[PDB]
């Protein structure tokens, strides 16, 4: 399956004028468009080569949407101060994620339309694309308003319609990069510690998409609490990397296994030093 997702952030900065407003769009794990109100001449901008195909009308339309959006977030930030009885002197954040998970045959798997204030869940459109989950009493005020206004209906329409249709167009136009499956190249490194034991590090490199699991086992037991596991990270060439490590006794390396799961791996990898 694939996803089209927009990540939106409005952050207030009292004394330095208007809140900064940003949108960033992704197809799967590939950044393709961006808006930043702090740019010289704020406009929607291309972030992947394949979107540069779109004509001026696309960029103008998307810039307009961003600018209308920006205005609502300015209002929302002010309303939030009232809902939470907060001073007007401090910086606050409103986040906004909306998008669609879609099977390759065009079927919608899941639509998202959800918000967070100062880093915590605020309100989210449920899977039914009809009702809202409100995280606190402030969000319940919003819920009642959006229920009254029938807000979910037009949101649902976007998620089932435009979001799906444009995702399909993007996947077609950018297929040479977007439709890739690059399996992880994996290996284990061995590092003797001054303490007289060993760090084993299981590496996964050059994979796409980014979704992956990397786990260490001993005697069939996953070493969840023991391992150090870094966030999956972009290599900056359209692929990703990740590693997981455990500390083990010298001479017992061979008992430990690293397990790698990825869509590019019909059978997961098991690696043993």
């Amino acid at each position: 399956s694939h996803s089209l997702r927009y990540f939106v952030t409005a952050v207030s900065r009292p004394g330095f004028g208007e809140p900064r407003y940003m949108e960033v769009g992704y197809v799967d794990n590939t950044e393709f468009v961006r808006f930043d109100s702090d740019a010289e001449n704020p406009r929607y901008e291309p972030r992947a080569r394949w979107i540069e195909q779109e004509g001026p009308e696309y960029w103008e339309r998307e810039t307009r949407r961003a600018k209308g959006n920006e205005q609502s977030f300015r209002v929302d930030l002010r309303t939030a101060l009232r809902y939470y009885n907060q001073s007007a002197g401090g910086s606050h954040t409103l986040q906004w994620m909306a998008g669609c998970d879609v099977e390759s045959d065009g079927r919608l798997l899941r639509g998202y339309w959800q918000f967070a204030y100062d880093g915590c869940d605020y309100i989210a459109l449920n899977e039914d694309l009809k009702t809202w989950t409100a995280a606190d009493m402030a969000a319940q005020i919003t819920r009642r308003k959006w229920e009254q206004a029938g807000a979910a209906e037009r949101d649902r329409a976007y998620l089932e319609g435009e979001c799906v249709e444009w995702l399909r167009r993007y996947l077609k136009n950018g297929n040479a990069t977007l439709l890739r499956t690059d399996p992880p190249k994996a290996h284990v490194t061995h590092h003797r510690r001054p303490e007289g034991d060993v760090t084993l590090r299981c590496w996964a490199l050059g994979f796409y998409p980014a979704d992956i699991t990397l786990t260490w086992q001993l005697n069939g037991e996953e070493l969840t609490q023991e391992m150090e596991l870094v966030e999956t990270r972009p290599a900056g060439d359209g692929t990703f990397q990740k590693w997981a490590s455990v500390v083990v006794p010298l001479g017992k390396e061979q008992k430990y296994t690293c397990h790698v799961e990825h869509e590019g791996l019909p059978e997961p990898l098991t690696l043993r030093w």
Partner: peptide, 10 residues
């Protein structure tokens, strides 16, 4: 194409 708030505020 991205999502619109449509001036429906919190």
């Amino acid at each position: 194409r991205g999502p619109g708030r449509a001036f429906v505020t919190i």
